[PDB]
Design a protein around this motif. Structure first.
Motif, short mmCIF file in Angstrom:
data_model
loop_
_atom_site.label_atom_id
_atom_site.label_comp_id
_atom_site.label_asym_id
_atom_site.label_seq_id
_atom_site.Cartn_x
_atom_site.Cartn_y
_atom_site.Cartn_z
N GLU A 48 12.02 -34.66 -10.40
CA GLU A 48 11.87 -35.86 -9.91
C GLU A 48 11.90 -36.02 -8.28
N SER A 49 10.91 -35.80 -7.69
CA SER A 49 10.83 -35.54 -6.47
C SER A 49 9.76 -36.55 -5.54
N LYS A 50 9.95 -36.92 -4.54
CA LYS A 50 8.98 -37.66 -3.64
C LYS A 50 7.72 -36.72 -3.46
N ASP A 51 7.94 -35.55 -3.38
CA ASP A 51 6.64 -34.46 -3.28
C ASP A 51 5.96 -33.94 -4.64
N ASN A 52 6.45 -34.51 -5.84
CA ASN A 52 6.08 -33.96 -7.03
C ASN A 52 4.48 -34.94 -7.43
N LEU A 53 3.54 -34.60 -6.59
CA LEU A 53 2.37 -35.48 -6.83
C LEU A 53 1.41 -34.78 -8.03
N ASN A 54 0.29 -35.36 -7.77
CA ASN A 54 -0.80 -34.95 -9.00
C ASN A 54 -1.60 -33.78 -8.59
N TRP A 55 -1.69 -32.73 -9.22
CA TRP A 55 -2.94 -31.78 -9.23
C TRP A 55 -3.80 -32.25 -10.33
N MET A 56 -5.06 -31.74 -10.47
CA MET A 56 -6.34 -31.84 -11.36
C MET A 56 -6.72 -30.64 -11.56
N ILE A 57 -7.00 -30.47 -13.00
CA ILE A 57 -8.13 -29.43 -13.19
C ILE A 57 -9.24 -29.99 -14.03
N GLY A 96 -6.58 -30.35 -5.41
CA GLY A 96 -5.18 -31.01 -5.08
C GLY A 96 -5.37 -32.33 -4.51
N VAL A 97 -4.28 -32.60 -3.81
CA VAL A 97 -4.16 -34.11 -3.44
C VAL A 97 -5.31 -34.57 -2.52
N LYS A 98 -5.84 -35.94 -2.40
CA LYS A 98 -6.96 -36.31 -1.70
C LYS A 98 -8.17 -35.59 -2.21
N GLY A 99 -8.06 -35.07 -3.50
CA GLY A 99 -9.22 -34.21 -3.86
C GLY A 99 -9.70 -33.21 -3.19
N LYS A 100 -8.83 -32.42 -2.77
CA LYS A 100 -9.16 -31.04 -1.93
C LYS A 100 -9.49 -30.15 -3.09
N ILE A 149 13.63 -30.40 -5.02
CA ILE A 149 12.41 -29.58 -4.77
C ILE A 149 11.40 -30.42 -4.08
N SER A 150 10.77 -29.78 -2.82
CA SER A 150 9.74 -30.27 -2.07
C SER A 150 8.65 -29.12 -1.82
N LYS A 151 7.42 -29.69 -1.13
CA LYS A 151 6.57 -28.79 -0.93
C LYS A 151 5.86 -29.10 0.56
N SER A 152 5.12 -28.32 0.82
CA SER A 152 4.01 -28.58 2.01
C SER A 152 2.64 -29.09 1.39
N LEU A 153 1.60 -28.65 2.20
CA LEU A 153 0.21 -28.74 1.84
C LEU A 153 -0.54 -27.45 1.94
N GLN A 192 -13.50 -23.90 -1.52
CA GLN A 192 -12.01 -23.97 -1.26
C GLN A 192 -11.70 -24.72 0.05
N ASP A 193 -10.69 -25.43 0.10
CA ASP A 193 -9.93 -26.30 1.21
C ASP A 193 -10.84 -27.32 1.56
N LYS A 194 -12.08 -27.75 0.69
CA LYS A 194 -12.95 -28.79 1.17
C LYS A 194 -12.90 -29.85 0.25
N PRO A 195 -12.96 -31.42 0.63
CA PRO A 195 -12.92 -32.36 -0.15
C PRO A 195 -14.07 -32.67 -1.38
N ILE A 196 -13.78 -33.02 -2.50
CA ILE A 196 -14.84 -33.38 -3.17
C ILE A 196 -15.71 -34.57 -2.94
N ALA A 197 -15.15 -35.43 -2.23
CA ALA A 197 -15.85 -36.54 -1.41
C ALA A 197 -17.28 -36.01 -0.64
N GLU A 198 -16.99 -34.88 0.25
CA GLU A 198 -18.17 -34.20 0.79
C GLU A 198 -18.94 -33.63 0.01
N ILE A 199 -18.24 -32.42 -0.78
CA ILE A 199 -18.95 -31.54 -1.45
C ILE A 199 -19.91 -32.36 -2.56
N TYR A 200 -19.42 -33.48 -3.40
CA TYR A 200 -20.31 -34.19 -4.09
C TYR A 200 -20.48 -35.53 -3.77
N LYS A 201 -20.91 -35.77 -2.71
CA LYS A 201 -21.23 -37.04 -1.84
C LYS A 201 -22.32 -37.48 -2.56
#
Ligand SMILES: [Ca+2]
Ligand SMILES: [Cl-]
Ligand SMILES: [Zn+2]
Ligand SMILES: [Zn+2]
Ligand SMILES: [Zn+2]
Ligand SMILES: [Zn+2]
Ligand SMILES: [Zn+2]
Ligand SMILES: [Zn+2]
Ligand SMILES: [Zn+2]
Ligand SMILES: [Zn+2]
Ligand SMILES: [Zn+2]
Lengths: 262, 259
Positions: free
Chosen positions: A242-251, A173-177, A112-116, A187-196
């Motif tokens: 077990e998938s290349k795309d099974n990345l980390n999400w965060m709450i 999501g990935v890269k802190g989005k 199973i794989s994903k997009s973004l 939504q759709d914005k990175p936390i590095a920018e929101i919380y700079k």
């Protein structure tokens, strides 16, 4: 005296992580139900059944998965099995695929794989922030890839778990989005920018995200100008796969320190 | 020292209560998602498919639900569909119906569960768990054609309750200790284990019968320490309407010293 605030801190952090831990298992468990349901579709769709039964199957898959907003089926050698079903308060079937890079990616990955995350324009003209989940379809003896299954999961639909009657949770999501927060504009914005304005706190969260760990910390919130207790916990968003795309999400879960101290 | 102690006591007890609440919600969420998955298997099995398809769906079912250690299906009119799939380091297919609870489940069209028991697994290991049996019906949903058995491993819930801690206990019907860090207590009732404190055990058993929750204090005759005790019950068969959907309970001890 402040040792009393310190114990209040100890006790608050404990329950934040327990509270947060449940929210994670709840959301991840919901995603797991959908993947389990997809594997059944995957198994049956390519079997020797007639078109209407396949449509019957895709419709019932949407009905039983409230967080799924769309599903597409593609078969290499059957033109009449190239359909897209989108949630329109009921289901609208659109005939079509093949050149779709998602269908092509689905057929080149066993797991199973994903997009973004991305915004999809829906039949009612509204935008739904979501992400695609992909599986390949296989003929009887599993010998040949014969088609593709593509599921559009609505991230906005998780408002029930994240933002309904509360505003203390973020889905990242990935890269802190920011995928979903009570503050809709994030939504759709990175936390590095929101919380700079708090780069040390954001850099720890992003490190925790990349490594797939969990942690608690403090930060001054730039919107409320109040200091918050912050608990983060990552989880594999494709489940047990077990998938290349099974990345980390965060709450993330926040509690303003003032409410605790009295 | 007066208002301070009150602030610390009730804030620590609130943290203790909320933590137990979210663990209970984690466990019953794991169970309900397993029940949702079981309902899917239930509906697909009677559909017109080959034996190999039914087997692989049951095999996929076990692998997706980590708390299921075994599953079996029985068709009244398909002897080639009388099978049991059990964890065996991987999954092993065995062949077998005469279970009075399967007859109960089929004849009454109701879900039924067994009592907790020890099942000897293929690899020789013994697993404490429970059987949940569901009737199978035809496409038109008017006649019972078979039964589906799901063997839920109670021991497998140690990952949520017993791993890396010894402050949690899972309690079943009539105060039976289903899961505990002290393994010698499993399958034994609290009324005997903690006879020396009938006041607390009788409270626990009343809370268990009433489907309630409460915090109380007791002197533990093992540790010889005054502990608080937060308990909270939950329907173990989820939202299923059924006279077999009894309450289970998770208990949380915190040493009164911490408060
Ligand atoms: Ca806990
Ligand atoms: Cl029981
Ligand atoms: Zn239909
Ligand atoms: Zn059907
Ligand atoms: Zn939901
Ligand atoms: Zn400060
Ligand atoms: Zn008080
Ligand atoms: Zn509760
Ligand atoms: Zn589990
Ligand atoms: Zn857990
Ligand atoms: Zn002590």
């Amino acid at each position: 005296n402040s040792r009393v605030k310190e114990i209040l801190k100890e006790n608050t952090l404990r329950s934040m992580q327990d509270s947060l831990h449940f929210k994670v298992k709840e959301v991840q468990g919901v995603l797991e139900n959908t993947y389990t349901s997809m594997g059944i579709v995957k198994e049956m769709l390519p079997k020797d059944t007639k078109r209407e039964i396949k449509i019957h199957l895709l419709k019932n898959f949407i009905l039983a998965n409230s967080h799924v907003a769309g599903v597409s089926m593609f078969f290499k050698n059957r033109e009449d099995l190239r359909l897209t079903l989108l949630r329109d308060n009921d289901t609208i079937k659109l005939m079509e695929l093949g050149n779709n890079p998602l269908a092509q990616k689905a057929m080149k990955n066993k797991e199973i794989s994903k997009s973004l995350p991305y915004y999809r324009k829906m039949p009612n003209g509204a935008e739904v922030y979501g992400v695609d989940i992909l599986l390949p379809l296989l003929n009887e003896n599993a010998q040949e890839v014969v088609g593709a299954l593509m599921v559009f999961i609505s991230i906005d639909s998780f408002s029930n778990e994240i933002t309904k009657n509360r505003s203390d949770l973020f889905l990242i999501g990935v890269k802190g989005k920011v995928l979903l927060s009570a503050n809709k504009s994030l939504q759709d914005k990175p936390i590095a920018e929101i919380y700079k304005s708090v780069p040390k706190a954001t850099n720890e969260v992003l490190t925790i995200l990349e490594n797939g760990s969990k942690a608690t910390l403090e930060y001054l919130d730039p919107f409320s100008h109040k200091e918050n207790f912050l608990a983060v916990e990552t989880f594999k968003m494709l489940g047990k796969a077990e998938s290349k795309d099974n990345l980390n999400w965060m709450i993330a879960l926040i509690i303003e320190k003032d409410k605790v101290y009295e």
